[PDB]
């Protein structure tokens, strides 16, 4: 009896047992633990090779078990109908908190309770950085562990006091330490190895903004190209059909095809096949969300419209033409601004992003100061038509407008295909 070593259960009588479901499925003990909770009783582990053991009467359980884990870790346990039968109460921690001055004061109090010394400016800057890390203006990130780590780094750089300037130094150091990939990218762009047009017009070439998934979070431009050929209505997305991708009808490809066909019906057969590709790779594509860049590049290729290379184009587009929000807009805009700065700002570069992402825009202070200086113009659009009008500079109205030129291009492709079909009947 004196060799019984108490476990977790033998110490939480009348109390609270805090568990990690991740461990419960990683050690495979969830079955036994669930059975014990079902029984309301449990016995210590008995080694099966010791017949001269103790038939210990199961230890009664009178305690609140409060599992802890990620939402992803609980689906492995939610299959069991006993799981929802035992734990009736689900407390979901909101990933974001309301960004209000009361919450700013709460954050300051929490950091002080952590033992940090911070000036009011430092608290304001940390609150702003938390809002940015949540990537919404009015919701500050609740990941207080990350805020605590950032405050640690700022205190080390500030000597012990979280002055504002120390917090900007910590944020800059955070960016700089994982900046190697972007250093190589910018150095290549300057060296000309990766030529990205940041000036002038180009027909069918657009400067899309992508988040590299060959690397951690870093928005960078990728020159996206679209070429139009007279033929079938089939639309080929090369990056989404590099293999085992042409047998799958990707939602992005079908979305682009639907918008293109239903937008223009005088040649509703869609006499044009559109080839979409990315210059080089390091390009990672959703393959399930058609990009506004692809749509505008395809329209420019169809209508032979010189799009501005000054303005980057980002955004997910729906077949109605309604531009949707995209994740990690801040990284994309910052990356394009960095690439523009490395090549030198001409005062005309900019970014075209959905109006939906307006509440997600929390740009780094350098971009903001550039914007206030009239050197980097952030254009927000609602529908693909506005973005196309901004790129081409002209409107959808008047003689030789964008719509007229797109119609003329589709008509030329249609007549070329009709002449080809004449050759197939003679």
């Amino acid at each position: 009896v004196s060799l019984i070593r108490p476990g977790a259960v033998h110490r939480a009588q009348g109390g609270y047992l805090i568990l990690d479901a991740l461990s419960l499925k990683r050690e495979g003990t969830w079955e036994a633990f669930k059975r014990a909770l079902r029984n309301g009783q449990v016995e210590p582990v008995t080694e099966p090779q010791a017949p001269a053991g103790l038939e210990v009467e199961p230890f009664p359980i009178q305690m609140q078990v409060i599992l802890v884990g990620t939402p992803e870790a609980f689906e492995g346990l939610e299959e069991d109908p006993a799981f929802s039968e035992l734990f009736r109460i689900r407390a979901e921690f909101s990933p974001t908190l309301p960004a209000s001055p009361e919450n700013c004061t709460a954050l300051g109090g929490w950091l002080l309770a952590q033992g940090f010394q911070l000036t009011q400016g430092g608290l304001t800057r940390l609150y702003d950085e938390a809002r940015r890390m949540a990537e919404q203006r009015d919701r500050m990130d609740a990941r207080l562990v990350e805020i605590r780590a950032l405050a640690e780094e700022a205190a080390v750089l500030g000597g012990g006091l979280l002055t504002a300037e120390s917090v900007e130094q910590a944020i800059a150091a955070r960016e700089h330490r994982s900046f190697l990939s972007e250093e190589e990218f910018l150095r290549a762009v300057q060296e000309g190895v990766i030529r990205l047009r940041t000036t002038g017009r180009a027909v069918g070439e657009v400067n899309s903004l992508v988040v590299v998934e060959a690397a951690p979070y870093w928005g960078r431009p990728a020159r996206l190209t679209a070429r139009a050929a007279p033929g079938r209505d089939h639309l080929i997305s090369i990056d989404r059909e590099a293999g085992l991708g042409g047998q799958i009808f990707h939602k992005a490809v079908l979305t682009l095809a639907g918008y293109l066909r239903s937008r223009y019906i005088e040649h509703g057969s869609l006499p044009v096949t559109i080839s979409l590709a990315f210059e080089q790779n390091y390009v990672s594509i959703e393959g399930d969300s058609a990009g506004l860049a692809e749509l505008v590049a395809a329209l420019s290729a169809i209508g032979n419209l010189p799009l501005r290379q000054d303005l980057a184009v980002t955004g997910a587009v729906d077949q109605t033409g309604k531009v949707l929000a995209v994740g990690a807009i801040n990284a994309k805009v910052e990356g394009f601004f960095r690439v523009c700065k490395a090549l030198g700002l001409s005062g005309t570069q900019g970014v075209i992003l959905p109006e939906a992402n307006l509440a997600n825009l929390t740009l780094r202070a350098e971009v903001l100061e550039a914007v206030r200086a009239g050197q980097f113009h952030i254009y927000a659009v609602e529908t693909a038509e506005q973005a196309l009008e901004i790129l081409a500079g002209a409107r959808m109205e008047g003689f030789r407008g964008l719509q007229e030129k797109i119609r003329a291009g589709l008509e030329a492709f249609a007549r070329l295909e009709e002449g080809h079909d004449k050759e197939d009947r003679e």
Binding site: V1, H10, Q13, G14, G15, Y16, A21, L37, L54, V56, E57, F59, P60, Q64, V65, I66, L67, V68, G69, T70, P71, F74, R88, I89, R90, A91, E92, F93, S94, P95, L97, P98, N103, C104, T105, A106, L107, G109, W110, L112, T119, Q120, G121, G122, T124, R131, R132, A142, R143, L144, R148, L161, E355, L358, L361, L368, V371, R372, I378, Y379
Partner: protein, 98 residues
């Protein structure tokens, strides 16, 4: 449309950065009212419960800070008592009696 600076300026205006600020610590699960109410329900009723949320939310830290503030009726002392060298039963006693 061309966004102006003012619609883009989101940084909270910094007023003073030369003086330290003292603030009372916020209650556990501050701005996390859903978790607070769910935990209060799971505690008053003594129901089993589970917290979910993205990693690095400090769920353990905040949860342990909140639970320690809770006051619970004094638990009885539970202890293994051997009725023989093969049978060991479980004995419950008032607090501090073991």
């Amino acid at each position: 449309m061309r966004l102006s600076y003012e619609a883009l300026e989101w940084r909270t205006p910094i007023e003073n950065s030369t003086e330290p600020v003292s603030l009372p610590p916020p209650p556990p699960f501050f701005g996390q009212e859903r978790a607070r109410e769910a935990l209060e329900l799971a505690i008053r009723g003594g129901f089993h419960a589970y917290l979910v949320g993205p990693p690095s939310l400090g769920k353990h830290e905040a949860l342990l800070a909140y639970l320690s503030t809770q006051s619970v009726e004094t638990p009885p002392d539970l202890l293994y008592v051997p009725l023989s060298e093969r049978k060991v039963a479980v004995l419950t006693l008032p607090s501090g009696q073991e």
